[PDB]
Structure formats: C-alpha cells, structure tokens
Design a protein around this ligand. Sequence first.
Ligand SMILES: CCCCCCCCCCCCCCCCCC(=O)OC[C@H](COP(=O)([O-])OC[C@H](O)COP(=O)([O-])OC[C@H](COC(=O)CCCCCCCCCCCCCCCCC)OC(=O)CCCCCCCCCCCCCCCCC)OC(=O)CCCCCCCCCCCCCCCCC
Ligand SMILES: CCCCCCCCCCCCCCCCCC(=O)OC[C@H](COP(=O)([O-])OCC[N+](C)(C)C)OC(=O)CCCCCCCCCCCCCCCCC
Ligand SMILES: CCCCCCCCCCCCCCCCCC(=O)OC[C@H](COP(=O)(O)OCCN)OC(=O)CCCCCCCCCCCCCCCCC
Ligand SMILES: *C(=O)CCCCCCCCCCCCC
Lengths: 128, 459, 65, 99, 122, 13, 79, 56, 155, 87, 55, 177
Amino acid sequence: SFPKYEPSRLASLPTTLDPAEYDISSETRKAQAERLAIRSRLKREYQLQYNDPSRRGVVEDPALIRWTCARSANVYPNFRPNTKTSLLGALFGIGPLIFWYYVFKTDRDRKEKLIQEGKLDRTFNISY
Amino acid sequence: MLKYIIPTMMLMPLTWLSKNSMIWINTTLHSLLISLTSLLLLNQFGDNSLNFSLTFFSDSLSTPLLILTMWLLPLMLMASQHHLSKENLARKKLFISMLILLQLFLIMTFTATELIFFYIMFEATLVPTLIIITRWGNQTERLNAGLYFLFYTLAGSLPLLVALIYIQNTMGSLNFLILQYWVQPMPNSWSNTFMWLACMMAFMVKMPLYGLHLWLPKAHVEAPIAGSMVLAAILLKLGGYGMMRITLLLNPITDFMAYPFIMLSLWGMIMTSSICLRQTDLKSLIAYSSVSHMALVIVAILIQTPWSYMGATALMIAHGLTSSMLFCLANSNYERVHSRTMILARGLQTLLPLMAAWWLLASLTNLALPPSINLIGELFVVMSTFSWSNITIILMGLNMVITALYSLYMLITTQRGKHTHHINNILPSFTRENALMSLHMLPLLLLSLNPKIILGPLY
Amino acid sequence: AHIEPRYRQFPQLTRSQVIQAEFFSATMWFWILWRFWHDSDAVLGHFPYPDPSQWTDEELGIPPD
Amino acid sequence: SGYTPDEKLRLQQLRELRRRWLKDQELSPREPVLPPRRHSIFAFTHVLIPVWIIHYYLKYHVTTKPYTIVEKKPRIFPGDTILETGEVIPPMKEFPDQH
Amino acid sequence: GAHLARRYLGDASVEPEPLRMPTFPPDYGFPERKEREMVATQQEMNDAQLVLQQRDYCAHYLIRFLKCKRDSFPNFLACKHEQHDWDYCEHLDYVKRMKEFERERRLLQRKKRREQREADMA
Amino acid sequence: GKRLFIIKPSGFY
Amino acid sequence: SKMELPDYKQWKIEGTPLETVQEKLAARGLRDPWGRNEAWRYMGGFANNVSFVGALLKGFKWGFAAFVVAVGAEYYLES
Amino acid sequence: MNLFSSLTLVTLILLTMPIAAINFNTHKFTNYPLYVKTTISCAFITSMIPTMMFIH
Amino acid sequence: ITKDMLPGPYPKTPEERAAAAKKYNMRVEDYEPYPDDGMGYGDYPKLPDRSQQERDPWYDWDHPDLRLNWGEPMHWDLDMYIRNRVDTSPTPVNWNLMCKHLFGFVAFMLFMFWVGETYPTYQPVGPKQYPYNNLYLERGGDPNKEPEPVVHYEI
Amino acid sequence: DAPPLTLEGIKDRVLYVLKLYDKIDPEKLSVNSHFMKDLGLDSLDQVEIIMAMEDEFGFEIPDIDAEKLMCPQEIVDYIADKKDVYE
Amino acid sequence: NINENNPFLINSIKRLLIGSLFAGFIISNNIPPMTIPQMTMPHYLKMTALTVTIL
Amino acid sequence: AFLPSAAYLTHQQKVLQLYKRALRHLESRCVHRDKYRYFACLLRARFDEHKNEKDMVKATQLLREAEKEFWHGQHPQPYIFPESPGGTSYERYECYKVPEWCLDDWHPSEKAMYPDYFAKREQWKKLRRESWEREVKQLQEETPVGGPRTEALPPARKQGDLPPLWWHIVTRPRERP
Ligand SMILES: CCCCCCCCCCCCCCCCCC(=O)OC[C@H](COP(=O)([O-])OC[C@H](O)COP(=O)([O-])OC[C@H](COC(=O)CCCCCCCCCCCCCCCCC)OC(=O)CCCCCCCCCCCCCCCCC)OC(=O)CCCCCCCCCCCCCCCCC
Ligand SMILES: CCCCCCCCCCCCCCCCCC(=O)OC[C@H](COP(=O)([O-])OCC[N+](C)(C)C)OC(=O)CCCCCCCCCCCCCCCCC
Ligand SMILES: CCCCCCCCCCCCCCCCCC(=O)OC[C@H](COP(=O)(O)OCCN)OC(=O)CCCCCCCCCCCCCCCCC
Ligand SMILES: *C(=O)CCCCCCCCCCCCC
C-alpha cells in the first residue's frame, strides 16, 4: 500500500509517524510533566532576570558556559588512550601526511626526471 | 639603527616621568613620531642592502617588518588603555614599559647583522611577552599558556644556539653579509640533517608549524589585547624572518629536508582552517586562522623560489595587519559582553553598523580579496607552489574555500541574524575603537596602491 | 488621485496603463508581422537545400563500371 | 474549549498596555525638532570636468609613454586611399559573376 | 539525417567518414577537372583582417560587404545585397561540400559493387 | 500623518 | 480612514463553477459551506478571463491593422 | 583615438564618482538613488559613443 | 560559574549520574552521556542529534534564531546544527531513494554523453576547403620553408 | 501601499467572512458569538474558520493559538496583537 | 491593493520592453560577421527550434 | 510533543492539527479554488466518517494511518505564508527590530530632537521600575513550591498593578519597523 518512511541520520523520522508519540500511559505523562516543570523553572529563572530593570548586561547562561567548557577545556582531562583513540589518531593524523608525501614526492621525481632529460616543455617558463 | 633604538629607549623616561593623566597620550604621540620616522628605512637599493654599521643593517625584508613593528606600538597603546584604566599607576607604567621593551628587542631583532645577536634579541623577546601574558591576561589559564609559550620556544631554540655557535666556529663569522659570500654547500649527511633541524625548528615553533602550534591558541587567547596584537602581528614573523635569513646556509640539503614540513604545512593549513569552522571561542578562531595563514609562509620559504619569498613577505605583512585588526574587533565585543564565546552576541550590525563595516572589511581582507596585499601574498605563494608541484593547487584551492568559509561565518555569527535579547550593555562604538580599526585597515588598503615596498629583498 | 484599494472586487484601473499595454502589444505584433513580411527566410529558410540523389553521375564523375 | 479566564485577563491587560505603547510611539507635529540648518551642473561636474581630467591624463602622461595605448591598425579594403600617403589601394579581380 | 542511420544502424564501410575524406583521388572519374579559383588576393584579405575561417574561396564578397558596412554608417540596413551575395556564395560552397560527400558516397557504393562483382566472378 | 518612531541605534558616534 | 465593505449578500455562487461543485457534492450527499466566500473570485470584473491563445493575441488586432496600413503605405510610396 | 579612450575611461570614473559622494557625506541626501540613476543613464550615453565608433 | 556546575568526568555511580543530570538541568531518565571510549566527553549529555530547524518555530524561544531556551543543555555540535548549517529535518522522499535517483540520473546522463561522443552527429558535407595551401602562411607557417601544394577542384 | 488595519476594519472583515459561511446565520452573529456554545459549530468548523481567517488576512495563526480562538472578538484581538493596530 | 501606476515602474519596464522588442535586431545587424553563418540546411532542420518550441 | 503550557497533545488536538495540515497540503495539491473546495468537502466527509468513535485505541490507530496517508500524499513544496516560517518573507525585518534599550544609549543632542517622545518614555520607565518589585512579590506568592509547573503567567490580581513579566511583551518591536 504505502511505502514506510525510513529515517536516516540527515533525515530523521517525523513526529507524526513515530509510534512512541502515541503512548497514552501514565509514566509518559509523568516524564512530560517533569520536563515541563524543569523547562518552566528554567524559563522563570531566565525571565526574572531578563525583565529586571536593575540588570544591565549579559544574563549569564550556565548552559552556554558549560557548553564551551566542554568543547574546549574538558577534552584532555577525560581522554584515555586506548585502541580506538590510537587507531583514529594514527589514521587521521599521519595517514594523510604519508599520502601527500608519496603523491608529491612521486610527482616531483617524475617532473625532475622529465626536466633533466629535456622532455618537459619548459620553454617560456622563466617565472618560478 | 641607532636613530630608532634611542627614541625607543627614551620612551622609558617618557613613560615614567609623565603625569598620571598623561602617560597614554605622550607615549601614543611619540610612538607615532617614531613610526613616522620609520619610513627612512625605505632607502633600499636594487643591488645592495642598507648597511648601517657592523651591528645593524636592513634590506627590503626587514624594512616592512620594522615599519609594522614601530607602527604596532601606538595601536597597542590605544587597544590596551581601556581595560587597564582601573589599573594601578605603577603597574600601568610597567605594562607600557614592557611594550616599549618588546619593541626595543624587536627592532634590533630584525636589524641584527650577526646571527647570534639575532638569537639574543630573538629570545629576549620572550621575557616582555611572557610577563605581559602571565601578568595582564584575564583568565586562569594564562600561567599554563605562558609555560607553553616559553617552553616550546626554548626547546626549539636552544639547539639553534648550538647550531649558530657551530657555524661561528666553522665559517669564522655569523655576519649575514659575510655569510652571503662565504656560504658553502651543505652536503647530504646525518650531521647536516640535525644541523638543518637545529637551524630550522626554533623558527618552525615561532611560525608556528602545524603540530608544534599548540602554544598559540593558548598564548594568543590567554593574553591581553596588546599581547595578542604583538604575538600575531610581529612575533609569528620572527620565524619567517629567521627562516629567510637561515636557509641561505642550508643549501642544498633543504631541497629534500623540506618535504615532511611542507606536508605538515600543506595538510596543516587544511586542518587548522577547518578547525576555524567549528570554534566557539572567537579569539581561538583568529588564532587557528593565524596558524593557517602562516603555514603558507612556511611552504613558501621551504620551496625557496623568488615568487615564494615575495609572496611570503607580502603575506606576513598583510596577515600582521589583518590578524591584529581581527583581535582588536574581538576585544571590541569582549569589552562589552565579557565573554569570548562567538555565539553569545549575535546580530551586531543592528546595533553597531560602522563597526560591522570594519568587521566586513577585516573579513574580506582575511579571505584574501583582490587587490589587497593579503591576496597578493596568497596568490604569489599559490603561483610558486604550482611551479613546485602542479597538484598542490588542490590543497591550495580547497584552503581558499575554507578560508572564505570561516571568514564569513565569523561575520555571520557575530554581526548577522537576530540579536541576543538578554544582552543590553552593547554601547555605541567609542571613537578610540573605530580609530584603532581605521589605523589597522587604512594602511592595509593603501599598501594595495604600492605593494612593491612589502615584497622583500628580491622584488 | 492615486488608486484606492477595493475589497473582493476588481480594482480601479488607470487609462494610461491600459493604453500603454495595448500600444506595446500592438507594437509587438506590428514588428513580428513586419519582419516576417520583409525577411520571411530567417523562419522558413534562406536557400533551397538540394536533394543529393537528383545529382547526375557525370557531374560527380562516376564512370559506370 | 479555548482560553482560561486567567489567560483572558492577562492577555487583555497585555493588549491594553501594548496598545498604549504603540500609541506612545507616535510623533508630535513639532517633532523631529531639528537643529537650525546651475541647471546642468551634473553635466559639468560629473561629465565635462572628468572628460577634461582624463583627456589631460591620456594625452600628456599616457600616450607620452610607449605601448600604453595600443590601437588595432585600421581595416584596409580594396579601393581605399591612405590619408598619410595618398596611395590608392588597387581593387580586386573582376568577379566570376554568380547571379 | 538519414545518413546517420546509414552509417550507424546500417553498414559503415560504404558511408564516407567525415574526418578523413576524400579517400579517392580528385581525378578518379574526371578527365581534366579544373581547380577552384581564389578571387581575393592574400594581401587583400590580410589588410581586410579577416578571420581565418572567413578566408575561404568566397572571402571577396565578404570584403565588399564589410567595405559597404563601413562606408554606410550609421545606416546599418543599406548593405543587404552584399550580404545576400556573400550568403549565396557560402551556400554555393556548402553545395560543393555536399557534392563532395555525395561523390564519396557513390564511389564507396561503386567499390562495394566492384568487390561484389569480383567475389561473384572469382 | 500617523508618523511612527523608528527605534534605531545611536547614529551620533 | 474608514473603508466600506460591500454587501455580503451579492456573492451568490449561481453562475460560477462553485455551482457545479455544489452539484457534484449533492450528487453524493454533501454540501459546501464556504462557496459564498469563494464566490468573488469567479464573479465581477474577474469574470470571463481570457485563454492562453487569447493572452498571446493581445494587441494582434491593432497591430495587424497598423501592419496593413504600413504595407499599403510602403506599396504606394515606392510608386 | 583621443575620443574613444577618453569616453571609455570617463564611463568608469563616472561610475566611481557616486561612491566618493556616498563616502564623503555628512547630510541626508536629496535622493541619492536619483543621483546614481542619472549617473548610470549618463554612463550609458557616454559608453554609446565608443560603441558607435566600433560599429563604424 | 563554579566548578561543580562545569562538566566533569564520566559518571559511573548512579548518584553521580543523578548529580550530572541535575547539573545539566535534565531528568535522570533522559540523561545519557557519550559512551566512555575515551574521546574526551566526560559527563556531557548525548543530546538526540537533531537539527535546530526541526524545533517548533512558533514556540516562544529565548533565542529565536537558535530556537533554544535558557539553561537548556546545548548539543555538542550545536554550532553545527544551527539553521545556517546542517539540517536533519525529514524529507518527503526517502534518503536512500533520493541518493539512488540522483546517482542513476547523473550516471545515465554521463553514459549517454559518452555514447553520443562515440557516435556523433554531422552534416552530409565534405571538409571546409581553404585556399593558399590550406592557409599555410596565415596559420603561422614560416615562409622560408615551402609546404606541399593543397589543391582544390570545382564540383 | 499596504493600508493599515483598524479594529473596526478587522472586525468588519472577520464578521464578513463569517457571514459568508453557510453554518452561521448573519442575524444571530455578533462579535461575542461563541462557536461551540452559541453558534453550535464543530471543532472542525472552528479549524475551518481559523483557516478562512488565514486566507483572509494573509498570515498563519499557529495551532496552539488557533485552538483558543473561540469567538470573533478573540480572533479580532489576536489579529490586532499580531499586526500591532491602533498605534 | 493591486497598483502599478508609478512612472518609475512604467518607464523601467518600458525601456527593457523596447529592448526586448528591438535589441536583437539592432545588435545583430550592427555586429560584424565573426564566423560564417550556416544558412543551408533541410526544411525539417531549419524548422527544428520553432516546431519544438510550439510542441 | 513540545508546547509551552500543555505537557502533551490530546487526541483531539492531534486530529485538528492533522485536519488543518491535510487541508493546507491539499490546497497545495489542488491549486484552483473550486477544485480545492470540492476536494476539501470530500476530505471533510472523510474526517466526519470516523468522528463518532468512542473506542480510543481504534481512534488512535485511525489517527496513525491517517498520518501515514498524509505523509504519503503531501506536496513536496507546500504553500507557506510569506511571514510564516519557511516563507519567503519570514524574519525579513528582524534586522530592523532594534530593541528599545538602545534608546538609552543615544546622545542628548539626538534625544533633544524628540523631546515629547523621551519625556513620554521616562514615565514608561518609571512605571516599569515601580511595577517590578510588586510583580516579583506577586510571582513568589503565587508560584507553588518546587517552582512553576507550567509556563503560564498570572494576570495582575489587584487594581493598578501591572501583569508580571510584562515589559518585553509590551515593548517588543513592530513587525514592520
Ligand atoms: C594615495 C591616496 C589614496 C586616495 C584614495 C583612497 C584609496 C583607498 C583607501 C581606503 C578607502 C576606503 C575607506 C573607507 C572604508 C572604511 C570606513 C567605512 O566603512 O566608511 C563608510 C563610510 C560611509 O558609510 P556610512 O553610511 O557613513 O556608515 C557606514 C555604514 O554604517 C556601514 O558601511 P557599509 O557596509 O554600508 O559600507 C562599507 C562598504 C562595504 O563594501 C564592501 O565591503 C565591498 C568591497 C569589496 C568589493 C568591491 C571592491 C573590489 C576591489 C576593486 C576596487 C579597487 C581597485 C579598483 C581599480 C580598477 C581595477 C583594478 O565599503 C565601502 O563603501 C568602501 C568602498 C571601497 C572598498 C575598498 C575595498 C575593500 C575590500 C577589502 C579589500 C579589497 C582590496 C582593496 C584594494 C584597495 C585599493 C586602494 O565612509 C566614510 O565615512 C569614509 C571616510 C573617509 C575614508 C578615507 C579613505 C582614505 C584614507 C587614507 C588616508 C591617508 C591617505 C590620504 C588619502 C585620503 C583620501 C580621502
Ligand atoms: C621544538 C622541540 C624540538 C626541537 C628540535 C630541534 C632540532 C632537532 C635536532 C636537534 C639535535 C641537537 C642539536 C644539533 C646541533 C647540530 C650542530 C652540529 O654541529 O651538527 C653536526 C654534528 C656533527 O659533529 P661534528 O660536526 O663535530 O663532526 C665533525 C664533522 N664530521 C661529521 C665530518 C666528522 O652533529 C653532532 O655532533 C650531533 C648532532 C645530533 C645531536 C643529537 C643529540 C640531541 C638529541 C635531540 C634533541 C632534540 C630537542 C630536545 C628538546 C625536545 C623538547 C624538550
Ligand atoms: C567541469 C567540472 C564540474 C564539476 C562540478 C562539481 C564540483 C563540486 C562537487 C560538489 C561540491 C560542492 C557541493 C557540496 C557542498 C555544498 C555546501 C552548501 O552549499 O551547503 C549549503 C547549506 C545550506 O543549504 P540549504 O539547506 O539549501 O539552505 C536553505 C535552508 N537552510 O549550508 C550549510 O550547510 C553550511 C555549510 C558550511 C560548511 C561547509 C562544509 C562543506 C565544504 C565543502 C568544500 C568542498 C571543496 C571542493 C574542492 C574541489 C576542488 C576541485
Ligand atoms: C539526420 O537526421 C541528420 C540531422 C541531424 C541529426 C538528427 C537531429 C534530430 C533533431 C532535430 C530535428 C527535430 C525535428 C522536430
């Protein structure tokens, strides 16, 4: 009848087609009301400072500061060298270095061997 | 050069004897007078350099670096007087004295005729920079960043000391003018291999080389604004100046010793530029862009063609002006929002339109828009690396996409979109800030009219 | 007076836009018919494309062998 | 169903304050209180003086230097007469007339 | 465009390949065929600065047309007859190219009939 | 008539 | 200031394709409630809009008239 | 020669003059779009002369 | 901001997981960190990897262009899922069907351009014939040499 | 261009659309005529009325705001709030 | 609120209207010949673009 | 799903939102007004056929396959209103929506160009800064323990008082500045 929509990484499943949206249980109402309570407490704590006439400046968000501290400063203190990190750091670290080394060395050996035999047309080449 | 050394030294009693409301204005005035006098270095000849004495000389490489060095001190004084307004008076004078002392080390770094005096000034430039970062930096990490900045430089440069004294014993001299005429070919050996490494790795750290660049997005981020200006505008160029002096002595071994480092730069300018696509810290984004631009200067020195040296010195002067202006713009936001997070304060063209025009011009010179000298240096390095190998254009051109992409994303995140609602301390742009932007940008655009003075010894 | 907006009905028209629109439509059809009357070969064809089979073998130099 | 009376009362009060705000965005007729402050001049300042300047620059600084203005030499036909010399270009061969 | 079908869908050895043709001598079937005569002098179409595609066997009509077009400025519609003379002589040249294609087609059909008569005989 | 105020940043500086 | 809206009762769907819509909806037991809202699009000055070949031939009449005038003028002018 | 190249460069410099006008401003312009439109009308008229003497 | 509101190490004990969930202002049932393979995440939550375009565009957001509230934990790649960038919104056609259609269309067109290059169209004419030895001097041929005579005949 | 909206004009246009709707008689209708409690209209009819409002005034009302507009006066006041009338 | 009675709009579409009526004729009769135009072709081939456009 | 005051979507809300989305995507499919009007009545009949379903599991299942029907039969480029998200004029004027606090940053020689406006603005500022502590103590005496459950704000429960957290709703910029 109908083709089932297959969600991918760059195209997620719609809310209208997800089965877990149609849960009418009590515990999902618990989780949704608790998320509403946490979000309402965050909203209230925001706009009690946002609407303040005495405040003049930047409402500091601990979520944003926490995000930047995770993206920059917490990376090395929670690094553990193991199999996956060693293979990915040697695969994406020195793999391209080896690759471009052999490509550029091969191209320049071919070019120098053509030049010292008089084969490469270097006729009007006086800028280098 | 003693007509430039003695006024720079007389800036010390000029700043320690001034009245307390006068110590910025007098130093700014007389540093602008020294920078006006800095144009007398332009007595350059087609055959000979301008050789002042046994100790000092200046060719057309050191001359734009000297004019940029003597021009950057008034701009650092303008940039650093707002956030040090609440400072103690004696510490304020010590700050100005550290900047004066750093300029004094730099102008006889670039004019040192002899290479161990070059080394002594080149390593004397650590101490004011280290003191400025670790004393007047803002955050906690400035102590660690000062340690990284100190101990990458010294670990690279103490082999250079042994190498220069070895050249001193072998050739009899470290005069660059003598070593132009007594240079011997450096044959293939392991002795000459580690000779080449000891001559080059200190400047590879100073550029920075990719892989050795880890000091830079700490030391350029944990510093005050004058420290970031002098680091990214002058102190990254000590490495390129030192390589252009020292690769004279390293032939013909450089013709195969350069092959790993060229890869480390040709891939490095792909990686660090890509890092600028995903940076949250705006000052760190400018830092990784500095690594990306200096990778081209590393490649251009290591392929050692005339077009490459011309493009490398043009790109060093252009990147000095551009990156100094970008750090000053990031400080113009940081003095208002007190955070270096780039996603925090958005839509600033709605509030600061002329400052958004300065952001636009700095980002267009960042992405090497013709006919700026940014593009002149970029394009000439691209020409010379195409002559080196016809494949490298790919790694050039892909870089020239990503160099556009972070330069405008930085413009789109900071200046465009809807503004942040909870931030309401966005003052109008002070006359000092727009003055600083114009003193960065108007020399950079006027140099497009006459680029031959920033094209180096072999124009 | 400028044009007053109307509700759920056909709007007020100026005479000038009507006569200009009709004048340039008439100018288009005048120019099309004029250039089709005088050129007539940019559309239908300039020179007669000959049939190569109708050519004799003697002018093409074919000895019957 | 629709609103609750709490939401009705709040949105009514916000509507009243919003309309008062939008009314107080209007302009007084004295406002903006300002501080106290040749027919073909475009053809003279933007055309004729630039034609003067650019013709002076091209005539006495550009064409005084070699190869700065290089013009393609003029197309010569059979039957022409050279102005510098007076040499008549001879005509073509008579045509093997086709139609 | 039926010759595209006669070379592709049909047999290709009997259709002349336009890259390398004529494959036959120009006198094969011609007792004293005369040459094509160039009217415009090489120096004349050099001084007329004609494009190197326009320096064919009918460039003299183009030289007369361009001299008309220069000598009748700004009246840009006053040289329709010289343009028609040049277009008709280009048409005659295109007809001659068609005649060369047809001569090569009929000679390849002649070679087909020759080898078939030979193979039927011996 | 009914001219409305245009809120804009400080164009003085 | 005040804009006067017309009488709402004039937008009757008789004479419109909304009438044919109501015919086909009554043919299977339905009723269209929003027809009189849609009635102004099919009535008034928007009634009897041209076809595409009538849209192309806008100005063909006066254009062909001026064409015949100019052909007669150039035929009488050469003699 | 002296007409062709003159009006050639006058077209381009004429286009660059309203950029100097908008960069050297202090007042609110009396219809700067009309000024730029008049400038480009005149630049079109100016560029038609080397076009005509290229047709010639 | 203080240290125990900053991100820390990977939580293992359930009170540490609940303290992390309280720190990032989310439920313990919804707090899932990145799995401790040593990639440098720590206690940072693995938010469900959706774009910001997918959010409710009519909701009263604190940041309207970001579509992001105050104190809500940001995604690790929040600078990547901004609406200037990668959108993971659902598409009417399936992703794999889109990739197959685009790949097949481009491959078929390039195949048929190669086919038409192998079998080109042309006109039933001879070669264009040029005088003066196929224009020997006009194509830069040197006059001190002498080419072969190229002779064209009437037809 | 773009003539301004008034509460009298928005009221006249909203009631004009509701008078063109066959499930509402025009003499019972007022600005307080509740759709479910007075006019006796379905929730589907309320959704169609809000969609007719969208097609009338040329902008989209979100559904979380559409499901609370249960009288003509609240619709007129919502259009007043989203078009900022009586400046 | 359909209205187009501004002389800016009318003149600005009007000059490109005169261009779209006459500019191909004017330019293509003012340009010099730079190639040789193919003007001999069969009647299904001369009528290719017009018939395909009409279809 | 995601709502400011409601913690979920009821079955009735899901049915009405599906009905509106189906009519909008149908109007995108069925461009002409009589033809859309015909098919809109047919779709209204399809929605009315299962309106009286008291079995909630059957009704939720019918809602689910009706969503599948919708996701199959949607237009790839549906019509979006211009100021609606995804529209061609959406958030166009946000660069002209300068916030009101920037008027505090003006020079006095450009504040003196509009003396009535800023004299009328200072009483709004005074009104807000006297209303602030009253509405803070109103919020803390009405919010339950554990914080507010929903994002719904109360009105002013006295006379003369302003509603709590009112300044950025009232002093928001216009849609067409
Ligand atoms: C030796 C003497 C030399 C004399 C001539 C001068 C030579 C050039 C010098 C610099 C010129 C530009 C300076 C102004 C820009 C910075 C400030 C600014 O934005 O002001 C806006 C402001 C007007 O705006 P506003 O409405 O008031 O407020 C701004 C808005 O809020 C918001 O603003 P906005 O966004 O609306 O407007 C910004 C807009 C934004 O537009 C852009 O960003 C687009 C630009 C890029 C694309 C177009 C250009 C591409 C390149 C081609 C042009 C060069 C070659 C042309 C030749 C032919 C081809 C080879 O930019 C402009 O309008 C500027 C036009 C010129 C741009 C130049 C290129 C910059 C791009 C990056 C570098 C590329 C290479 C540069 C090569 C320079 C060669 C000289 O202008 C001024 O107030 C001007 C102040 C005075 C300027 C003095 C300039 C000279 C200073 C030198 C002093 C010492 C020497 C003595 C000479 C003195 C001459 C008077
Ligand atoms: C940035 C951090 C890394 C910095 C790297 C710096 C360069 C890397 C290599 C340095 C080697 C040491 C200096 C070499 C000086 C060469 C001068 C010379 O005369 O050479 C020829 C001489 C040759 O001897 P000779 O010249 O006296 O002999 C006479 C000549 N022949 C050979 C013909 C008989 O070389 C040497 O004597 C030894 C050279 C290699 C020394 C190895 C020991 C050092 C180990 C590596 C240290 C690396 C950096 C340490 C810091 C790391 C971070 C904390
Ligand atoms: C004759 C030969 C002809 C050959 C032709 C083909 C050659 C090129 C092959 C394909 C490469 C280019 C196309 C792929 C990248 C496209 C990126 C782009 O434009 O992204 C747009 C996207 C937003 O787009 P959209 O969602 O439509 O926005 C409207 C609603 N948001 O915006 C974003 O998501 C923001 C993205 C920002 C970061 C960009 C990351 C990707 C960078 C890619 C670099 C590619 C370098 C290629 C080098 C080639 C060298 C030869
Ligand atoms: C043989 O047919 C030679 C003509 C060129 C190849 C075929 C071109 C077919 C398409 C053009 C004519 C289309 C007529 C509707």
